[PDB]
């Protein structure tokens, strides 16, 4: 039940000693399914730091201190292993390789595009695959709609304008317009679809009076000629 978010909620509510998660087998082990080895850089580790620093006062009501300290031992051991491996890795380097430039370009651009979830070109119907497109657009809409409205730039070209304490520079909004062109272009999609239908179903709906090589064929001219035959008058 997200104990690694329950610690964050108890920290941000500023009352963590008053509850202390009721560390028994019935409560502290029901959310764990040891502790699950936190994932973040420090956002789930500083919480463990503060949690141990608050639980130094009771020291016996909470039996889960030992598994947390075992994970501190694991973190210290992994850190010492990485420091020894970084000491050896800087000694295992060849004296000459002369890494190529125009492949370093491609690795940097490819890593940068693979960070922020966009498609990388290689250079090295069916409503199953219709929903898998219409579920990537809701991703982008509900990711752009969580940006703060007070978003603003600071380009490297405001130094040539000498902005005072209150001067209102003229390149402050080169990202918030761009973060609304996407968010409103991804909501006007089923309007340009309905305009493209009215375009194609009135250009292709003639198809034999505008295109020259179709209205000059034998069979099209014969069909258009034969539909215009006025019915025979008996007597």
């Amino acid at each position: 039940l997200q104990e690694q978010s329950e610690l964050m909620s108890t920290v941000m509510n500023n009352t963590p000693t008053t509850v202390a998660a009721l560390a028994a087998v019935a409560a502290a082990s029901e959310t764990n399914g040891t502790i699950p080895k936190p994932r973040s850089s420090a956002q789930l580790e500083q919480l463990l730091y503060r949690y141990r620093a608050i639980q130094n006062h009771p020291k016996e009501n909470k039996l889960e201190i030992k598994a947390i300290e075992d994970t501190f031992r694991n973190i210290s051991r992994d850190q010492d292993i990485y420091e020894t491996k970084l000491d050896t890795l800087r000694k295992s380097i060849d004296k000459g390789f002369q890494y190529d430039e125009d492949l370093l370009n491609k690795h940097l651009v490819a890593l940068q595009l693979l960070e922020k979830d966009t498609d990388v070109p290689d250079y090295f119907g069916d409503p199953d695959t219709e929903i898998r497109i219409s579920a990537r657009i809701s991703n982008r809409i509900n990711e752009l709609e969580r940006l703060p409205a007070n978003l603003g730039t600071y380009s490297l070209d405001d130094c040539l304008e000498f902005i005072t304490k209150d001067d209102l520079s003229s390149r402050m909004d080169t990202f918030k317009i761009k973060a609304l062109v996407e968010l409103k272009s991804l909501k006007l999609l089923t309007k340009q679809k309905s305009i493209r239908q009215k375009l194609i179903n009135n250009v292709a709906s003639q198809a034999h009076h505008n295109i020259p090589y179709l209205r000059d064929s034998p069979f099209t001219a014969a069909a258009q000629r034969s539909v215009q035959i006025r019915s025979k008058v008996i007597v």
Partner: protein
């Protein structure tokens, strides 16, 4: 498949027009469409039927 279109007529005429030019250059065989319709054993079997009809009618 009961009806025809402009695409069907154009494809039929283009196919039948390219099959005729490929017999001058002899880059297509077309021996199967020849011999499945000639079929000389069927021809002599039919001639034997005509001969038996001559015998039965005389």
């Amino acid at each position: 498949y009961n009806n025809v279109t402009l695409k069907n007529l154009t494809a039929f005429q283009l196919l039948s027009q390219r099959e005729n030019i490929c017999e001058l250059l002899n880059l297509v065989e077309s021996t199967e469409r020849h011999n499945s319709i000639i079929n000389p054993e069927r021809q002599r079997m039919s001639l034997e039927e005509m001969k038996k009809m001559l015998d039965a009618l005389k």
